[PDB]
Structure formats: structure tokens, C-alpha cells
């Protein structure tokens, strides 16, 4: 179902609506594109523009609040646009960070219309969209050099999300009505280089599963069982993948690992009966 040459500039992200019927591509050309996919067809609708620097990542909001797609660019700003009347418009612009923003994912509709922003400005922001338009932002420093990922943890307070460091550190953050904002929990060390990406699973089974990919060219699957329980570092393999590792994605169900390399190859992984990993 290829959509050959969607952009002019190299593409940095390919995400779909909750109903895999409409896509969203973003590139360096500072532009994002909306799509329609059927059997093998690709209808190109609008092309989102207002981004000064290369767009990095984008994320589809839950249909619960209509059609909304958020994008983050080098321009140190993340922007969201809705699709009222089949015509794409820019609803709000979030630019609190001072430097590139490399990741932006939406919170489980349960939580609400929340967006988690992680900038290379070393900080991270949490923003929910009220009514009138003016939101109440929440920012908290998260890493030394910077921040590269900010995946969320499923619903359960009890609001958690993992961060990937520019300083090689993976962290866990849980809300706190007494602290007024998300505070640190874990600080799982493991990578020798920078944490390129970290995604948290929705697999509600007995134990929690977290993925961490990095310039150190390895994935460390962080498995923990309960509050007490510490996270068990686990090398996806006791060798190095020839190139870096940029993305890690969790399948809806069946909990399978989508590990987008850098050697330009995508690999899939599963945890056999023991607790190790194998292809698919």
C-alpha cells in the first residue's frame, strides 16, 4: 500500500488516525500531510504549514475530541490542527521550550486532551486544552543535555510516563496532587550513549513492559511487576545492531516490538515462553 514520494525532503514520521483510514506524514520541508488509505489507494488532502524548521514527529489525538494531529519541529514549537468541515486549520500553537522539540504524544483519552512535549531544551511540558483556548501548561526539567522521547503509561493520580535522555538516562514520572506536577520515580540506567527513543506499552498483563532504544545501538526492555518491584534491565540481544536505533513501537495487542533501526531496517520482536526475545 505504498504512497511513493509523499514529500520532497526526507520524511521523519508516518502516523495514522485511530482508525487507520487517514495518515499523516511530516518532513524537513517543514510540512506535514494528511492522507486517506484504502486497499492500496492514497488520497492526499491538505498540507500543514506554519513550521519554520524541520518537523520531527506527529501524533493523532483520540477521535473522542474529533480529528486532531499534533506536530513538533526543530523550531522549538509543537502545533496542533483540527479538521472541522473536512478543511484543516491550525487550532493552537505550543511553544514554551527553548530549542527543538523531538517528541510529542497524546495522553489516553481517559486522561483527556493532553499532550506530552519533550524538548531538547532539556525540559518537558504537559498541556491540556481547556475551552476558550488558553491552556494551563506544566513544565519540569527532565534531563541534562536534553530530552528525546516522552511516551505515556496506560491509565490506572497514577499517571505515569517514561522519558529518554540526551544524557543516557531513562526515567519514570508519576503525577502528584501534592507536588502539583509530575515528579520523578525511576532512573533506569543502561545505555552508554544517548537515549534515542522510549515507548511504554498498553499491555495490561501482570507485568509492565517498557522499551528503550539509543545511540548506544541497543534496546533495553525494562520489565517491572509492582510498586516495590524494581525494573529488570534486559538486553534485547547481547550484541550491537550495526547502526543506531531511532524508534521503538508497541503493538496494540499481542505485545510485539517494532524496532525501527538506523541501518534503515525495521525489526519485529516477541518474548518467547522463558522471557527472552526472538524475531517474527
Numbering used by the authors: 2 to 157, 169 to 292
What wording appears in the published article?
In eukaryotic cells, newly synthesized proteins are transported from the endoplasmic reticulum (ER) to the Golgi apparatus through the action of the coat protein complex II (COPII). Sar1 recruits heterodimers of Sec23 and Sec24 to the membrane, thereby forming the inner layer of the COPII coat. Sec13/31 heterotetramers constitute the outer coat layer, thought to polymerise into cages that enclose the budding membrane.
The connecting rods are consistent in shape and size with Sec13/31 heterotetramers, and are bent in the middle by approximately 15°. When we analysed the distribution of vertices and rods on the tubular membranes we found that they assembled regions of rhomboidal lattice.
